[PDB]
Amino acid sequence: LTGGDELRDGPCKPITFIFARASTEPGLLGISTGPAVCNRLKLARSGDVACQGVGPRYTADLPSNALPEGTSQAAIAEAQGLFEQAVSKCPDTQIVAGGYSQGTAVMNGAIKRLSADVQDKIKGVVLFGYTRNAQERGQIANFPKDKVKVYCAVGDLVCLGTLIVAPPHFSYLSDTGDASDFLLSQL
């Protein structure tokens, strides 16, 4: 595979972007907001970005949205391990991350379990259609609020503590530019 597995495939890059896709999306980065942000970072920092999607253990299946933390424990464990691997395998890399829909639940569940040292390496996180928005009060638990930017479109009910999917939930491509600028700013 060429895209989505750049941390595992190496070589180390100055910037490592870790992303968790939305339910039903195939691959590692998905086919919507993940590639959109990854590519914007690659254009802004030519040759210095490695994009890594959370998979294959995170299957992005629909049923997992109803589990306690909004996703599977396997997906959370996989994501957590990828953050830890980035810091160990590439000591000089700066991490930026993102999630979309169920992917944001993966990000919240994984990052809140990370040590302070690893969290300090994560400069910024963008969450599109944050399914844990209401439950986490617009942030990621046990992580700085200023390092997270949440994109919850008007009418996207998953940000209101429900799993109801409406049209606004698929309007995030229009926010990928702002999200990419945010991540670059945090770096």
UniProtKB/Swiss-Prot annotation:
InterPro entries associated with the record: AB_hydrolase_fold, Cutinase/axe, CUTINASE_1, CUTINASE_2, Cutinase_monf
Active site, per annotation: 101, 156, 169
Disulphide bridges: 12-90, 38-51, 152-159
UniProt GO BP: carbohydrate catabolic process; lipid catabolic process
Superkingdom, taxonomy of origin: Eukaryota
Assigned GO CC terms: extracellular region
Entry similarity comment: Belongs to the cutinase family.
Protein name per its UniProtKB record: Cutinase 1
